[PDB]
Assembly symmetry: T
Homo-oligomer: 151 residues x 12
């Protein structure tokens, strides 16, 4: 992951698995707070989809070839998936979302660094904008869980 | 179409009493979650009013005569009302709404079946659409309570 | 100190609930020339009555009262009288029924205005004033359709 | 399998085309008290009829059929009869004409439902059910304006 | 070339539309009878449309170097429309027929405005009058139809 | 002006003449600030029309008979009109609008007081709301003119 | 009398034009379908708008609009044919051009007749319709690689 | 070059300018420092409350200016003339305590608006009287809802 | 796929793979018509996400457990994925979309039939509504390709 | 036909230079009134662009060939441009806009006359509508400058 | 260590809070020709200042900081000085005061840009860049009203 | 900031000529695809006008003096214009747009570099955002032509 194209493709894989994890959280959620957090997962999925559009389009624009099959996403992503379980508590589900978002914020920092080293300023801006928004979500999720952001 | 007319009128009575119960829950709600659930009861009331419109209008269209006094609603409905009470817990209020919705979904199954037996496809569809949404709400309310829909 | 304002707000909860029921009967059983305009107009009036019901019930809860909240309580405490629906009522008779209900509500709202003013409950007083204003405007328009002066 | 479903979709293409023309005649030639309500109301009904024409023609094409698509085909295949426009028709005679058209359409839509309910094309079946529901609701309202029961 | 007559007819329209607006307001306020609920707000739509022609025609007069009438005295004195005291006892049919008469007058005035501006070569003014006449004549057809009558332009 | 009906009808006349004066200011305006103040007169005319609607409708509702001819407006209004003149400065035009608004605010105080005495609380509120807005405009116009409101 | 006759001619011809456009919309296949199929809907809505304007003006003038499919079909100068899927996009768009050239010519006739009669309201309705139809002719022709050739 | 002279309807309007400015600051503190279950509904609710407070500040400051007054218009003036007390922000506060703080601020404001209602009524300034009445109505509705979240009766 | 729950879960897997395939077509598209069909794939992706929401939520509501990992989607779907290739023509890409949509319409017919025999009229309607819309897309794509729908 | 096409093409050149002049006025404006008049130039530019669209499209429709290079616009326009200068007063700027608009209104009268002579009624209407609005702007600009329109 | 980025964000919280107060003073005490344009313009500028306050305070919280959140803290930490309101200030003087505040904010935002670039806090860096761009554009417009170049 | 100012003014000239070229393509377009690409040129012109506003305003803000005559735009732009020609193929028109956009993207990279060198971070962002969008359009135009972006 030492060129802009490679880190954008890593993000295509990781955002695709993150979307799948968010969807599991949305579907399997139970507990007090469901009525606010279940639809919130749809907002986060739309957010992730937007990152995926910006980063995939930029990769194509640069002459790359985005991963575009579930096998590629699953094999390249560093995120791990588990079977859905309704008995996970809402506190646990929100903590899972924070863990996913911390990973994405770290990936986006890597993308920011790789693109800055290569002078790809457009790609650098894409990762900076996505990092800003995801870190704001981490502050809010952590605040609901009674915690500091701990970036 | 005597039985289709009869089940549409039963729904007019039951939806009228359901709306009154939801209004009670809206007004008397106290406890953590109030700010989400108090306005949610307004959304459920608006939806119940929409079914009351659809079903009353269809009954009139079929040559029936809708119940249209409080006495007729209360005496024909199988839902029981009790005095308002601020000390019902918020989770008990949600379970009250689940009980009302389980009753409505069962009524709408009966309506679906009666209208099918009398060949009244328009009435059958009104009950089918209403049942779908009420069952979806039962899932969400049960999820907030940490439980399965049990439908 | 505000027992009477609370009592008149709860009277309004009952009467607005029965008024809504009567308006619904008019909406459903209406037949006659003018149906196409007055049938949906009843829906507009029902939505407005629901608005006053929200304002007045919320104010009652806010003052530490307990709104009537069952159909039996509305029926027993309202001063309005319901009758079985009948398609043979003329559309002019239906509109006159609405005027009668509205004249009662305007009178109830004046009572609420006076009681709340006596007790110094200026917020409740304004709720009854705004509601009375609009109901009276409706009485003018309904009466005008019926070829009459408002007769307030 | 699909023959009856396609045939009734095409019948509906012809009948809806002629119904649209009849409603346009009513819209244009209308005179009398109620004009200002009922003249624009015919535009609303015409837009609804055009909506069903789009749904039904599109499903027919989708199923491999070929919609009627000339005025001659519409006129020859429709069971509705058109007459010269006449400004002397009374407004209640115009509304009765619309009710007659709508009763025919509701019966056609019931036929469409009947050939597609188990047998035939399930998507066609939903289209005809939604259309029948709305037309029957209009028959109630038109009949109510005329002081009558729906008499379905 | 002199646009004195295009200016004069625009100003005549300023006065007449002002008085027409007042008559329509009277109809709106004093209306009683079956049909009130559709025709009372309809008079508001008509007032708004009359106000729009007032804006178009006054602005064009000003643009042409004219001086619009701008006092009630000037409107009342220069208008050819006559006003009567408001009366709640006028039937809906009579009120609609009064509006028809006002509108036939306006359509006639706008035809005069069309002809004068055409003769003076003022094509912008000409178009303003043409567009206003078209809509007023459409309303006359609709009002007359409510009254069970042909437009009879 | 004896009673609520009478003061409402006085306002019908005075608002009608005020609208005419505002229209004159709108049409005849010339000078720096035209592009702000010419459309502002349209806003003020629309506000005036709104009070005319509220007050006329209330008068009809009370069983009165609104003035409804130009002769009645002109004869009963206390406002005086003069011929339009392009040579009036914009600051004189705005001062003329202030004068009209001070008159209306004073009339609406009279309407407030008469209706209060008669126990006509609905009419009372109409006059109070209208006075509030007109006085706010007097502040703003006076400020443009470099002066205190001086109510 | 002549303005009324040409308005009614337009009622018939616009009715048939609408039917032809609908045939084009329904039977369309070929590359370009996804842009041109919904474009026919826009043209149909525009044609219905002219039909409203022209029929209402005719009624307003004391005329009696054609108001039956048989009257439209018999009085229109446009010819309809059975619908067929085996028509290329270029032939479909050329059909639309032919119908629009006809309408633009009819609207010019309406303009001339109304001008002669001094019916300026009717004159303007024909002028506005002709302007828009001619703009569509340019675009359709351009898609076909052609000049407008009015 | 002196402090605003200590002073009627103008005086209570200016008191409200100071108190609303401090109430806004306290709501903003609650918004920023909020943690605990309920954050996702109450954090944005504070923004709605701040916008509402800003609305009253506009109504009341504009009325004061219209009456020939001179609103407080510096942070020193708001802080020193307000009866509300601010404390340093702290993340360790529970949702229940945060909402209780908002209730206390709103009870104070409703009491101030009753005083403004009473003064303006005595003076015959009916426009000012209505501004205070409308603001009081909405604040008291919020007190009911906040209290209901806390399981409490409104106690108004 | 013997009960409604099983066919709804099959749809969860197949819609998830169909979404991935549509995303590939969106990204790798080249040829005349790109400017209209590239954004059309976004519309189809949103349509598929809509089907997925209706069907997953109904499965949860019925007491089932949706597939919710990429491994589950890949393994259970009958749709096959291939590596992205820019050197596929737009005609080939649209034909690929038609193939996917024919499969989904056939799945929705299976779901319609299973739910119909169970008397699960709500689930039956979800499949019928999705059938109707996807088959309308097949008509349009085929028409662009110069062909009959050939359902 | 030839003369209408020639006047429409003249308008394409003149509107292009007028747009450039108005942009200069927008950019170099300084003085009291900037905050009203700077954005007003944008409204005027948008309106000029609208006439450029109408007149160029009509020219193409008639079989003509619009000027479509800056060289053609500058060489064929009758309007003269000068270097931008911040030192111009607001009132001098507005006067420059009035001069441009007077020229455009005269050109549109010529276009109206020529198209009327040729019987090109569609072209005639385009010039008439454009002239009407430009003359209304001349009234308002002149009013701001304390003057009559002086058409 | 993001000590310096946190510190400059908190400096902005204080300074934006005082700037909002100064703009509110200008809005309230404004008199003179141009009032009708510049009085509401101050509301737009206040809304903009409040937007930057939200962006910068939220970023500070997200980074683990603790925003100033009392009026005493804002006043004591801000570098901007407030004076008592005065109706007798001319429009030109009021606008010049706003320019001076905005020049200060732009310089603060350049400091925040610099500090955050040095510390590698690219998200904070972008927040200050976007705010500086807009404030500088306002300086151009205000100076242009005042007959002057921006003189950044 | 002399060189940041100069590159902004270069962009004012270049964007003005690019808008003229895009207008020519819009007007003279003939061939299959006209109906999608003709209005597309309007979107691209509106976007170019947006950059012209951002860049000109920034130049004014920095104390510069934007080019503001057609002569200055033509003299300073490096884009060459030719006479309009209806017989250019539609695919050649799209390739002409790609050539103009490759030039603009190179100009914007130069603007990014010069402003970064001079420490003008605001101007730097303006150029980065504009370059990102133009590069995205090059991908899409190239894809229509069946080819890679080839940045
Ligand atoms: Ca950005
Ligand atoms: Ca409790
Ligand atoms: Ca060619
Ligand atoms: Cl509880
Ligand atoms: Cl070509």
């Amino acid at each position: 992951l030492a060129d802009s194209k490679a880190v954008l493709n890593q993000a295509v894989a990781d955002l695709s698995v993150a979307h799948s994890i968010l969807h599991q959280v949305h579907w399997y959620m139970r507990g007090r707070g469901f009525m606010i957090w279940h639809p919130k997962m749809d907002e986060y999925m739309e957010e992730i989809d937007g990152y995926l559009a910006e980063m995939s389009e930029r990769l194509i624009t640069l002459g790359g070839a985005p991963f575009s099959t579930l096998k590629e996403f699953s094999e390249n992503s560093q995120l791990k998936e588990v079977l859905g379980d309704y008995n996970v508590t809402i506190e646990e589900q929100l903590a899972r979302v924070v863990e996913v978002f911390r990973y994405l914020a770290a990936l986006f920092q890597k993308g920011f660094d790789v693109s800055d080293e290569e002078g790809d300023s457009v790609t650098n801006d894409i990762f900076n904008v996505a990092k800003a928004s995801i870190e704001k979500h981490i502050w809010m999720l952590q605040a609901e869980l009674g915690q500091a952001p701990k970036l």
